[PDB]
Design a protein around this ligand. Structure first.
Ligand code: HEC
Length: 82
């Protein structure tokens, strides 16, 4: 759950829904794509700070108040969302 925590303090929800979709890929659709995709959460974490674009919607995603460990955990949790 180390991901739910950060995701809770991080507005990642206002745009990333786990049961719905807003601006970014719904954590549920994101996990299904990068599910058990070890190594992917690491690449996604970079998109969190360096923003992401081209993996889902045409609109890129600005960086967030998160950090390295704050992005990785979110990456491993988003990919292993359970
Ligand atoms: C709306 C302003 C968003 C907020 C707030 C957050 N994210 Fe986001 N994210 C958003 C979009 C539109 C996209 C798709 C970008 C694309 O073109 O593919 C994303 C994507 C991600 C991804 C996936 C990156 C990839 O290359 O696949 C991750 C891992 C991600 N977002 C993480 C993330 C986190 C941790 C957030 C809270 C700090 C967060 N996003 C907020 C839009 C928005």
């Amino acid at each position: 759950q180390d991901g739910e925590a950060l995701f809770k303090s991080k507005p990642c929800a206002a745009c990333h829904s786990i049961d719905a979709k807003l601006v970014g890929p719904a954590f549920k659709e994101v996990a299904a794509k990068y599910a058990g995709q070890d190594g992917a959460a690491d690449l996604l974490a970079g998109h969190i700070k360096n923003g992401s674009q081209g993996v889902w919607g045409p609109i890129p995603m600005p960086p967030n108040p998160v950090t390295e460990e704050e992005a990785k955990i979110l990456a491993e949790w988003i990919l292993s969302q359970k």
